[PDB]
Amino acid sequence: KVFGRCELAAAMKRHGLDNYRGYSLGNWVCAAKFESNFNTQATNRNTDGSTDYGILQINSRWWCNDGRTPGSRNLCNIPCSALLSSDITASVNCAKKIVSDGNGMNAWVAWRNRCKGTDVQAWIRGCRL
Ligand SMILES: [Cl-]
Ligand SMILES: [Yb+3]
Ligand SMILES: [Yb+3]
Ligand SMILES: [Yb+3]
């Protein structure tokens, strides 16, 4: 599923991401835009042989099991395929663990490089929240 900007904002809010660990909703929407272009099916292979999955590009080295990443810790206790669902619940629940890991949203390189320090509230402008 390819989400609309406000559609995703609403879905993320419903699943408790607005101000989760102090990160306003716009941060999450901005991260999703540059990680996956709002596409739940996005996958990208990393240089270390791991793969990133879903709307928030969660990595198979640490967070989910894709059956081809030796030494995966599977800390979200889920198959990576579950992160490609049109239902974002699994992605959101796993992202909540990632952002609590100590480095906050810096865990997402696209957030650090493209969202951090910008006017992220723009990403929820015009939406019914
Ligand atoms: Cl933080
Ligand atoms: Yb990425
Ligand atoms: Yb990556
Ligand atoms: Yb409201």
JSON list of C-alpha atoms and ligand atoms in Angstrom, two decimals:
[
{"chain": "A", "resi": 1, "resn": "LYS", "atom": "CA", "xyz": [0.00, 0.00, 0.00]},
{"chain": "A", "resi": 2, "resn": "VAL", "atom": "CA", "xyz": [1.17, 3.51, -0.85]},
{"chain": "A", "resi": 3, "resn": "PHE", "atom": "CA", "xyz": [-0.19, 5.86, 1.81]},
{"chain": "A", "resi": 4, "resn": "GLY", "atom": "CA", "xyz": [-1.17, 9.46, 1.37]},
{"chain": "A", "resi": 5, "resn": "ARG", "atom": "CA", "xyz": [0.61, 11.93, 3.65]},
{"chain": "A", "resi": 6, "resn": "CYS", "atom": "CA", "xyz": [-2.39, 12.71, 5.87]},
{"chain": "A", "resi": 7, "resn": "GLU", "atom": "CA", "xyz": [-3.67, 9.12, 5.68]},
{"chain": "A", "resi": 8, "resn": "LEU", "atom": "CA", "xyz": [-0.38, 7.90, 7.15]},
{"chain": "A", "resi": 9, "resn": "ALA", "atom": "CA", "xyz": [-0.31, 10.69, 9.73]},
{"chain": "A", "resi": 10, "resn": "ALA", "atom": "CA", "xyz": [-3.77, 9.60, 10.90]},
{"chain": "A", "resi": 11, "resn": "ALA", "atom": "CA", "xyz": [-2.77, 5.93, 11.00]},
{"chain": "A", "resi": 12, "resn": "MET", "atom": "CA", "xyz": [0.41, 6.71, 12.96]},
{"chain": "A", "resi": 13, "resn": "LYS", "atom": "CA", "xyz": [-1.53, 8.85, 15.44]},
{"chain": "A", "resi": 14, "resn": "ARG", "atom": "CA", "xyz": [-4.10, 6.06, 15.95]},
{"chain": "A", "resi": 15, "resn": "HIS", "atom": "CA", "xyz": [-1.22, 3.66, 16.77]},
{"chain": "A", "resi": 16, "resn": "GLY", "atom": "CA", "xyz": [0.25, 6.02, 19.39]},
{"chain": "A", "resi": 17, "resn": "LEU", "atom": "CA", "xyz": [3.28, 7.54, 17.61]},
{"chain": "A", "resi": 18, "resn": "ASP", "atom": "CA", "xyz": [2.39, 11.22, 18.15]},
{"chain": "A", "resi": 19, "resn": "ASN", "atom": "CA", "xyz": [4.96, 12.40, 20.73]},
{"chain": "A", "resi": 20, "resn": "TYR", "atom": "CA", "xyz": [6.19, 8.84, 21.38]},
{"chain": "A", "resi": 21, "resn": "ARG", "atom": "CA", "xyz": [9.48, 9.31, 23.26]},
{"chain": "A", "resi": 22, "resn": "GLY", "atom": "CA", "xyz": [9.07, 13.05, 22.59]},
{"chain": "A", "resi": 23, "resn": "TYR", "atom": "CA", "xyz": [9.00, 12.83, 18.77]},
{"chain": "A", "resi": 24, "resn": "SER", "atom": "CA", "xyz": [6.09, 14.75, 17.27]},
{"chain": "A", "resi": 25, "resn": "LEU", "atom": "CA", "xyz": [4.02, 13.15, 14.53]},
{"chain": "A", "resi": 26, "resn": "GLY", "atom": "CA", "xyz": [5.73, 15.20, 11.79]},
{"chain": "A", "resi": 27, "resn": "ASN", "atom": "CA", "xyz": [9.05, 13.51, 12.57]},
{"chain": "A", "resi": 28, "resn": "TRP", "atom": "CA", "xyz": [7.53, 10.07, 11.93]},
{"chain": "A", "resi": 29, "resn": "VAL", "atom": "CA", "xyz": [5.83, 11.16, 8.71]},
{"chain": "A", "resi": 30, "resn": "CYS", "atom": "CA", "xyz": [9.04, 12.80, 7.49]},
{"chain": "A", "resi": 31, "resn": "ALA", "atom": "CA", "xyz": [11.03, 9.64, 8.28]},
{"chain": "A", "resi": 32, "resn": "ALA", "atom": "CA", "xyz": [8.54, 7.47, 6.39]},
{"chain": "A", "resi": 33, "resn": "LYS", "atom": "CA", "xyz": [8.60, 9.79, 3.38]},
{"chain": "A", "resi": 34, "resn": "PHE", "atom": "CA", "xyz": [12.35, 9.58, 2.90]},
{"chain": "A", "resi": 35, "resn": "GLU", "atom": "CA", "xyz": [12.77, 5.94, 3.98]},
{"chain": "A", "resi": 36, "resn": "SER", "atom": "CA", "xyz": [10.05, 4.40, 1.81]},
{"chain": "A", "resi": 37, "resn": "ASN", "atom": "CA", "xyz": [8.15, 7.16, -0.02]},
{"chain": "A", "resi": 38, "resn": "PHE", "atom": "CA", "xyz": [5.12, 6.02, 2.03]},
{"chain": "A", "resi": 39, "resn": "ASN", "atom": "CA", "xyz": [5.19, 2.54, 0.43]},
{"chain": "A", "resi": 40, "resn": "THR", "atom": "CA", "xyz": [4.62, -0.36, 2.83]},
{"chain": "A", "resi": 41, "resn": "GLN", "atom": "CA", "xyz": [6.20, -2.82, 0.34]},
{"chain": "A", "resi": 42, "resn": "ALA", "atom": "CA", "xyz": [9.60, -1.08, 0.05]},
{"chain": "A", "resi": 43, "resn": "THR", "atom": "CA", "xyz": [12.67, -3.26, 0.49]},
{"chain": "A", "resi": 44, "resn": "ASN", "atom": "CA", "xyz": [16.32, -2.29, 0.14]},
{"chain": "A", "resi": 45, "resn": "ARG", "atom": "CA", "xyz": [19.43, -4.45, 0.53]},
{"chain": "A", "resi": 46, "resn": "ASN", "atom": "CA", "xyz": [22.30, -3.13, 2.69]},
{"chain": "A", "resi": 47, "resn": "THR", "atom": "CA", "xyz": [26.02, -3.62, 2.09]},
{"chain": "A", "resi": 48, "resn": "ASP", "atom": "CA", "xyz": [26.37, -6.00, 5.06]},
{"chain": "A", "resi": 49, "resn": "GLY", "atom": "CA", "xyz": [23.84, -8.42, 3.51]},
{"chain": "A", "resi": 50, "resn": "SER", "atom": "CA", "xyz": [20.93, -7.36, 5.71]},
{"chain": "A", "resi": 51, "resn": "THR", "atom": "CA", "xyz": [17.74, -5.92, 4.21]},
{"chain": "A", "resi": 52, "resn": "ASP", "atom": "CA", "xyz": [15.51, -3.00, 5.22]},
{"chain": "A", "resi": 53, "resn": "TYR", "atom": "CA", "xyz": [11.73, -3.59, 5.19]},
{"chain": "A", "resi": 54, "resn": "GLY", "atom": "CA", "xyz": [8.55, -1.57, 5.04]},
{"chain": "A", "resi": 55, "resn": "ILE", "atom": "CA", "xyz": [7.41, 1.98, 5.57]},
{"chain": "A", "resi": 56, "resn": "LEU", "atom": "CA", "xyz": [10.13, 2.68, 8.17]},
{"chain": "A", "resi": 57, "resn": "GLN", "atom": "CA", "xyz": [12.84, 0.49, 6.59]},
{"chain": "A", "resi": 58, "resn": "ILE", "atom": "CA", "xyz": [13.47, -1.73, 9.59]},
{"chain": "A", "resi": 59, "resn": "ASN", "atom": "CA", "xyz": [16.67, -3.76, 9.36]},
{"chain": "A", "resi": 60, "resn": "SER", "atom": "CA", "xyz": [16.93, -7.57, 9.40]},
{"chain": "A", "resi": 61, "resn": "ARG", "atom": "CA", "xyz": [20.29, -7.61, 11.20]},
{"chain": "A", "resi": 62, "resn": "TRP", "atom": "CA", "xyz": [18.73, -6.48, 14.48]},
{"chain": "A", "resi": 63, "resn": "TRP", "atom": "CA", "xyz": [14.95, -6.28, 14.32]},
{"chain": "A", "resi": 64, "resn": "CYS", "atom": "CA", "xyz": [13.23, -8.95, 12.23]},
{"chain": "A", "resi": 65, "resn": "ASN", "atom": "CA", "xyz": [13.96, -12.38, 10.76]},
{"chain": "A", "resi": 66, "resn": "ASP", "atom": "CA", "xyz": [14.11, -12.70, 6.96]},
{"chain": "A", "resi": 67, "resn": "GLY", "atom": "CA", "xyz": [15.78, -16.12, 6.91]},
{"chain": "A", "resi": 68, "resn": "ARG", "atom": "CA", "xyz": [18.89, -14.89, 5.08]},
{"chain": "A", "resi": 69, "resn": "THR", "atom": "CA", "xyz": [20.69, -12.61, 7.54]},
{"chain": "A", "resi": 70, "resn": "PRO", "atom": "CA", "xyz": [23.13, -14.71, 9.60]},
{"chain": "A", "resi": 71, "resn": "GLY", "atom": "CA", "xyz": [23.15, -13.74, 13.27]},
{"chain": "A", "resi": 72, "resn": "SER", "atom": "CA", "xyz": [19.93, -11.72, 13.14]},
{"chain": "A", "resi": 73, "resn": "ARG", "atom": "CA", "xyz": [18.80, -10.93, 16.68]},
{"chain": "A", "resi": 74, "resn": "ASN", "atom": "CA", "xyz": [15.10, -10.58, 15.69]},
{"chain": "A", "resi": 75, "resn": "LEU", "atom": "CA", "xyz": [14.45, -8.20, 18.59]},
{"chain": "A", "resi": 76, "resn": "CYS", "atom": "CA", "xyz": [10.91, -7.39, 17.38]},
{"chain": "A", "resi": 77, "resn": "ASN", "atom": "CA", "xyz": [10.21, -11.16, 17.22]},
{"chain": "A", "resi": 78, "resn": "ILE", "atom": "CA", "xyz": [8.59, -11.01, 13.79]},
{"chain": "A", "resi": 79, "resn": "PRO", "atom": "CA", "xyz": [9.22, -12.18, 10.24]},
{"chain": "A", "resi": 80, "resn": "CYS", "atom": "CA", "xyz": [10.38, -9.19, 8.19]},
{"chain": "A", "resi": 81, "resn": "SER", "atom": "CA", "xyz": [7.57, -9.93, 5.70]},
{"chain": "A", "resi": 82, "resn": "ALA", "atom": "CA", "xyz": [5.07, -8.78, 8.38]},
{"chain": "A", "resi": 83, "resn": "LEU", "atom": "CA", "xyz": [6.53, -5.29, 8.05]},
{"chain": "A", "resi": 84, "resn": "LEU", "atom": "CA", "xyz": [5.33, -5.06, 4.41]},
{"chain": "A", "resi": 85, "resn": "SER", "atom": "CA", "xyz": [1.64, -5.31, 5.30]},
{"chain": "A", "resi": 86, "resn": "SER", "atom": "CA", "xyz": [-0.90, -2.62, 4.38]},
{"chain": "A", "resi": 87, "resn": "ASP", "atom": "CA", "xyz": [-1.66, -2.70, 8.13]},
{"chain": "A", "resi": 88, "resn": "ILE", "atom": "CA", "xyz": [1.17, -0.71, 9.76]},
{"chain": "A", "resi": 89, "resn": "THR", "atom": "CA", "xyz": [0.68, -2.12, 13.28]},
{"chain": "A", "resi": 90, "resn": "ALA", "atom": "CA", "xyz": [3.73, -4.42, 13.21]},
{"chain": "A", "resi": 91, "resn": "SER", "atom": "CA", "xyz": [5.96, -1.67, 11.80]},
{"chain": "A", "resi": 92, "resn": "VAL", "atom": "CA", "xyz": [4.78, 0.81, 14.42]},
{"chain": "A", "resi": 93, "resn": "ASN", "atom": "CA", "xyz": [5.22, -1.61, 17.32]},
{"chain": "A", "resi": 94, "resn": "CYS", "atom": "CA", "xyz": [8.75, -2.48, 16.18]},
{"chain": "A", "resi": 95, "resn": "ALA", "atom": "CA", "xyz": [9.64, 1.20, 15.60]},
{"chain": "A", "resi": 96, "resn": "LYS", "atom": "CA", "xyz": [8.61, 1.89, 19.19]},
{"chain": "A", "resi": 97, "resn": "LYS", "atom": "CA", "xyz": [11.33, -0.57, 20.32]},
{"chain": "A", "resi": 98, "resn": "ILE", "atom": "CA", "xyz": [13.90, 0.93, 17.95]},
{"chain": "A", "resi": 99, "resn": "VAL", "atom": "CA", "xyz": [13.37, 4.53, 19.09]},
{"chain": "A", "resi": 100, "resn": "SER", "atom": "CA", "xyz": [13.62, 3.44, 22.74]},
{"chain": "A", "resi": 101, "resn": "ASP", "atom": "CA", "xyz": [17.04, 1.83, 22.15]},
{"chain": "A", "resi": 102, "resn": "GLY", "atom": "CA", "xyz": [19.03, 4.92, 23.28]},
{"chain": "A", "resi": 103, "resn": "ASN", "atom": "CA", "xyz": [19.74, 6.95, 20.13]},
{"chain": "A", "resi": 104, "resn": "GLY", "atom": "CA", "xyz": [16.14, 8.02, 19.50]},
{"chain": "A", "resi": 105, "resn": "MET", "atom": "CA", "xyz": [15.27, 8.65, 15.85]},
{"chain": "A", "resi": 106, "resn": "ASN", "atom": "CA", "xyz": [18.95, 8.88, 14.86]},
{"chain": "A", "resi": 107, "resn": "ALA", "atom": "CA", "xyz": [18.52, 5.12, 14.28]},
{"chain": "A", "resi": 108, "resn": "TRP", "atom": "CA", "xyz": [16.97, 6.20, 10.96]},
{"chain": "A", "resi": 109, "resn": "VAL", "atom": "CA", "xyz": [19.73, 7.68, 8.82]},
{"chain": "A", "resi": 110, "resn": "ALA", "atom": "CA", "xyz": [17.23, 9.42, 6.51]},
{"chain": "A", "resi": 111, "resn": "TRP", "atom": "CA", "xyz": [15.64, 11.10, 9.53]},
{"chain": "A", "resi": 112, "resn": "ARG", "atom": "CA", "xyz": [19.01, 12.33, 10.78]},
{"chain": "A", "resi": 113, "resn": "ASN", "atom": "CA", "xyz": [20.03, 13.64, 7.38]},
{"chain": "A", "resi": 114, "resn": "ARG", "atom": "CA", "xyz": [16.76, 14.98, 5.99]},
{"chain": "A", "resi": 115, "resn": "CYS", "atom": "CA", "xyz": [14.28, 15.59, 8.83]},
{"chain": "A", "resi": 116, "resn": "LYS", "atom": "CA", "xyz": [16.26, 16.43, 11.97]},
{"chain": "A", "resi": 117, "resn": "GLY", "atom": "CA", "xyz": [16.30, 20.18, 12.63]},
{"chain": "A", "resi": 118, "resn": "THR", "atom": "CA", "xyz": [13.81, 21.02, 9.87]},
{"chain": "A", "resi": 119, "resn": "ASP", "atom": "CA", "xyz": [10.24, 22.30, 10.15]},
{"chain": "A", "resi": 120, "resn": "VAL", "atom": "CA", "xyz": [8.73, 18.83, 10.48]},
{"chain": "A", "resi": 121, "resn": "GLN", "atom": "CA", "xyz": [5.26, 20.16, 11.39]},
{"chain": "A", "resi": 122, "resn": "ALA", "atom": "CA", "xyz": [4.91, 20.89, 7.65]},
{"chain": "A", "resi": 123, "resn": "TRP", "atom": "CA", "xyz": [4.43, 17.14, 7.12]},
{"chain": "A", "resi": 124, "resn": "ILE", "atom": "CA", "xyz": [1.09, 17.20, 8.98]},
{"chain": "A", "resi": 125, "resn": "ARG", "atom": "CA", "xyz": [-0.14, 20.54, 7.59]},
{"chain": "A", "resi": 126, "resn": "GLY", "atom": "CA", "xyz": [-3.75, 20.41, 6.36]},
{"chain": "A", "resi": 127, "resn": "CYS", "atom": "CA", "xyz": [-4.49, 16.99, 7.89]},
{"chain": "A", "resi": 128, "resn": "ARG", "atom": "CA", "xyz": [-7.54, 16.22, 10.05]},
{"chain": "A", "resi": 129, "resn": "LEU", "atom": "CA", "xyz": [-5.92, 15.11, 13.33]},
{"chain": "B", "resi": 1, "resn": "CL", "atom": "CL", "xyz": [15.57, 11.28, 22.14]},
{"chain": "B", "resi": 2, "resn": "YB", "atom": "YB", "xyz": [17.05, 4.18, 3.61]},
{"chain": "B", "resi": 3, "resn": "YB", "atom": "YB", "xyz": [19.72, 0.72, 4.74]},
{"chain": "B", "resi": 4, "resn": "YB", "atom": "YB", "xyz": [-7.28, 15.95, 17.71]}
]
